[PDB]
């Protein structure tokens, strides 16, 4: 099974330039469309361009100004794309999707690559429990996960197995500084008689921290 | 500049049925496909060339295209459908894609559940305090939080966020966040955070002392 993997969030100052890859895992990239999709910040999708390895064709949006560059591999089992003088405006998902050379749509899809342009500097989140103030009979639980850049952070409980109950809220920028929280709720009968772990990733700073509540 | 038209919104009761319209100039004799995104998700194909159906799809999602208007009919929403909709046309050697439709189940009204939590240890040890509250699961979406220390309202250094509305009960949750330092959060008893929304007459208010 055949699977679209990008690389990892990226950070670059304004006027630079990005590249981010589309790797076709286990699968190929002849006989397909490959295309180039991004999206800021709770905004809409738009095309950027798509490009054919079979017809060796690539094509672009206006509204890029020349900015796009999309590219392939010998292997033909990668694809890149290229944006160039980078401004704020370009803080967006970027995202590559495939389908087939005959038809119109893509059917496979990338998880996204988040490229945020910026000239703030990396810094490892700080990871605080929100412990029931000094119980009733459903209780909330919390991680605050403070002063981290850039995004994203990855937060779980219970290294995943828990999931019912959970709010993971949107992160917030302050000060070129990030912040997320996340609650969980529980029935009483369980806390502290279970550990309730936060689980917080920031590969940026390849930073892995647990957080029993 | 080829222009598609989707409704920035559409609202359903649960089990009922839900059509997303795809306003495109003679879009009819174009091939019509439409993309679902959850919040934290990447598009995922559900309806190509007008009305095909991907494996793994379910039925209740079906498409249809004519005129000027194509249409994404998804039948007994539940819950799990609650997401971002596109739709997407070639024209002119070009993609579009229509701005988002989202999708939004009802569900009855919700008094918000209140939290409130005092700083760690761990950020008091780094000179900081953070003092977080917790609004969940209410349902309509608009509230409101306040910020009072030992009885007067602070405004500042104050952070908010909210959640797209529950993949599993259609409510919505928000967190607020008030930060000082450990200094400042020492020079102060009272720390108080209370909730107004639509269910109640009075605000719901959650409060702790640094005392005990």
């Known amino acids: 099974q055949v699977q679209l993997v990008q690389s990892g969030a990226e950070v670059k100052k304004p006027g630079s330039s990005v590249k981010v890859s589309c790797e076709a895992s286990?699968?190929?990239?002849?006989?397909?469309?490959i295309t180039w999709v991004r999206q800021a910040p709770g905004q809409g999708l738009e095309w950027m361009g798509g490009?054919?390895?079979?017809?060796?064709?690539?094509m672009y949006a206006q509204g890029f100004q020349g900015r796009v560059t999309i590219t392939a591999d010998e292997s033909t089992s990668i694809a890149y794309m290229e944006l160039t003088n980078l401004r704020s405006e370009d803080t967006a998902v970027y995202y590559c999707?495939?389908?087939?050379?005959?038809?119109?749509?893509?059917?496979?899809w990338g998880q996204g690559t988040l490229v945020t342009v910026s000239s703030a500097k990396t810094t490892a989140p700080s990871v605080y429990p929100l412990a029931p103030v000094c119980t009733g009979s459903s209780v909330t639980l919390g991680c605050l996960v403070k002063g981290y850049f850039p995004e994203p952070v990855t937060l779980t409980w219970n290294s995943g197995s828990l999931s019912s109950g959970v709010h993971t809220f949107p992160a917030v920028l302050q000060s070129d500084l990030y912040t997320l929280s996340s609650s969980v709720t529980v029935t009483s009968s369980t806390w502290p008689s279970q550990s309730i772990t936060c689980n917080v990733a920031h590969p940026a700073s390849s930073t892995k921290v647990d957080k029993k509540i | 500049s080829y222009v598609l038209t989707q409704p920035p919104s559409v609202s359903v009761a649960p089990g009922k049925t839900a059509r997303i319209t795809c306003g495109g100039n003679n879009i009819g004799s174009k091939s019509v496909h439409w993309y679902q995104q959850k919040p934290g998700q990447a598009p995922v194909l559900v309806v190509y060339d007008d009305s095909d159906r991907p494996s793994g799809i379910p039925e209740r999602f079906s498409g249809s295209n004519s005129g000027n208007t194509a249409t994404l009919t998804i039948s007994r929403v539940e819950a799990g459908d609650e997401a971002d909709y596109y739709c997407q046309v070639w024209d002119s050697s070009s993609v579009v894609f229509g701005g988002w439709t989202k999708l939004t189940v009802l569900r009855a009204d919700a008094a918000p559940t209140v939290s409130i939590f005092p700083p760690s240890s761990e950020q008091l040890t780094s000179g900081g305090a953070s003092v977080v509250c917790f609004l969940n699961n209410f349902y309509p979406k608009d509230i409101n939080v306040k910020w009072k220390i030992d009885g007067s309202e602070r405004q500042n250094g104050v952070l908010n966020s909210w959640t797209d509305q529950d993949s599993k009960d259609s409510t919505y949750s928000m967190s607020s966040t008030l930060t000082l330092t450990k200094d400042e959060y020492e020079r102060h008893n009272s720390y108080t955070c209370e909730a107004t929304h639509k269910t109640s007459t009075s605000p719901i208010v959650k409060s702790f002392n640094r005392n005990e």
């Open positions: 286990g699968g190929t990239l002849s006989n397909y469309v």
């Open positions: 999707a495939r389908g087939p050379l005959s038809r119109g749509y893509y059917d496979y």
């Open positions: 490009f054919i390895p079979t017809f060796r064709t690539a």
